[PDB]
Amino acid sequence: MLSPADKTNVKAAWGKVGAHAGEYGAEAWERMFLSFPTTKTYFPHFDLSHGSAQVKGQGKKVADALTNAVAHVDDMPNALSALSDLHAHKLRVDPVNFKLLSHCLLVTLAAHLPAEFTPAVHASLDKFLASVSTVLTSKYRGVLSPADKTNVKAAWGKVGAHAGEYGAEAWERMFLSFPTTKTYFPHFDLSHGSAQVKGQGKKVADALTNAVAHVDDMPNALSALSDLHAHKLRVDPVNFKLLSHCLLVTLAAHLPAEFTPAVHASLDKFLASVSTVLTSKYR
Amino acid sequence: MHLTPEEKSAVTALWGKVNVDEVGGEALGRLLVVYPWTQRFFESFGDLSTPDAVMGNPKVKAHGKKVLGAFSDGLAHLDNLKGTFATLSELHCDKLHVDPENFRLLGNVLVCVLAHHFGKEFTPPVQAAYQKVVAGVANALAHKYH
Amino acid sequence: MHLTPEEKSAVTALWGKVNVDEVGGEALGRLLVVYPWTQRFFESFGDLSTPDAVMGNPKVKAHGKKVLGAFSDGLAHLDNLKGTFATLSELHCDKLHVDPENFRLLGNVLVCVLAHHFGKEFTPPVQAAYQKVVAGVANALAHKYH
């Protein structure tokens, strides 16, 4: 979460950017189109050659929006509310791409701000751009609606006493399908039927049962686990999306009736909210 | 693309039981419901307002069949996915302008649908083989992007 | 690893101007500062309590030089990264237990460091070539994971 020290560093860096915001913004877009060509799929209607008016205009628009973000960093969701709607409902850019632009904005500022681009300012800027990206993508699907909460409680109620059982299967599925997650468990027997995997699955299922019961107050209900993952276990956040998918596959295989398209959508949203809470204190 | 004998056998055995029409329409429909921004490529398909409309939309069903039929042909050439999908790769980049990340989302949705349809038979080792396969196909479809 | 002749030259030309020890200590330290969860492997290095303490840690600096030294060696084998890094891959998986996502984070941090160090000389096409190389290295280090 952005601290006032974080906000102080961003304001200092962006102020130094000043009236170059536009030029630098254009440069950041040019760098992304060259380094990550898949991003050009969102601009078939643009002349993407170097120095093009369209690219310069995109750069300037993005820079002014970032300036507005900087100037209202304590109220970002409301500052960028129109832009969040527009990316969510019209542009419909896949959220992975925001990371790629963020990286190219950091490379641009680094190349232009040798004095200011210290390790702490780098860290603060990275957090700032991830916060912006989160706010720009927060209406793609949105919070958990009352329909969502109903669907989740309906499906999880049906899980019932099998919570532990399905938890263990979810982990088994993940270690087999995504072998890199095994690096966080060098001290376990990971063979099929392992009691260590079973105990891990039940713990996680018990935590999920708690979140379901506290679906309106998850950050407090999950607080100690958020602390633990962030400060001790220190699991890279990419891994939470992998377990979430494996939980979904497990539910699908055991709930033929219950796993409708609508319930699928609600569960995926739920697990992403859980994952967000669990990684909220990493930085 | 390389798999163990154990993996390839599991993939081909299950696929023999897949009705590509029924599964294809299910997979594309769930993609549009679960990840609604993917709707940006199908504005001509009719109303996509609710899961009810998406799932029974006839154009969704038909496109789904086309997509998984092509997927099915890929499974006949697992050792050369890149050469098998080259033309479609180019089509998706140059004519349709589709972000390849969408190939990954569809891959995961497809695995969910297989689990939903086959239940207990879709065991952890079978899933793991399909995860390799859907990633191999997504990588093959992205290969000619520029 | 496939780069054009021009991509390769631009990579090698800039790298000849790099002080590997200084840049290596800078890249590993910013890694631990910007993505602090990566500190998990380095609990035995001493004080990592502040950015200054991280950047001035002599163990961090020495590890940084070790890592970018290996990287440096691989740039001489851009056409055989997988072969070059195979045993290092096995080591990082079987013995060190390093999630390969860390390799990608380090590659992005290295590109930022090069931009900081070389300013306007680190042009968009030169970044593009470095982006391919750091991804190739990451994929090669992750290749033998099982």
Ligand code: HEM
């Ligand atoms: C920090 C991230 C971003 C910010 C602050 C941002 C902001 C903006 C703004 C202010 C506009 C112009 C709205 C207007 O015309 O009034 C815009 C448009 C647009 N954005 Fe985003 N953007 C971001 C990321 C992205 C990414 C990563 C992509 C795609 C790779 C993207 C694609 C587009 C497209 C396609 C347009 C419309 C261009 C046109 O046709 O004029 N955006 N963005």
Ligand code: HEM
């Ligand atoms: C929905 C996401 C997750 C939830 C709810 C969750 C929850 C938990 C819980 C309840 C514990 C045990 C705490 C205790 O002993 O009091 C735990 C431990 C642990 N978690 Fe997470 N976890 C999640 C995701 C992950 C992921 C994706 C990874 C890594 C691939 C991971 C790795 C670990 C590790 C390494 C342990 C400790 C195992 C041991 O030494 O006993 N967690 N988790």
Ligand code: HEM
């Ligand atoms: C396994 C992945 C996929 C395969 C094998 C595949 C295959 C195909 C095939 C065979 C066509 C027919 C073109 C023709 O009839 O000339 C097509 C078209 C198309 N595909 Fe893909 N596709 C895949 C994934 C996707 C995804 C995930 C998206 C977008 C989210 C997508 C969007 C489209 C669109 C928009 C069309 C054209 C439909 C129209 O005429 O309106 N495809 N695809």
Ligand code: HEM
């Ligand atoms: C370009 C990426 C990397 C390269 C080329 C690389 C290379 C190396 C080399 C050459 C060694 C020495 C092995 C030996 O003693 O035989 C090593 C060890 C090690 N690396 Fe990596 N590495 C990379 C990235 C990383 C990252 C990102 C992390 C973790 C954040 C990491 C963690 C470690 C650890 C914990 C050791 C052992 C230190 C010791 O025992 O003193 N490596 N690496």
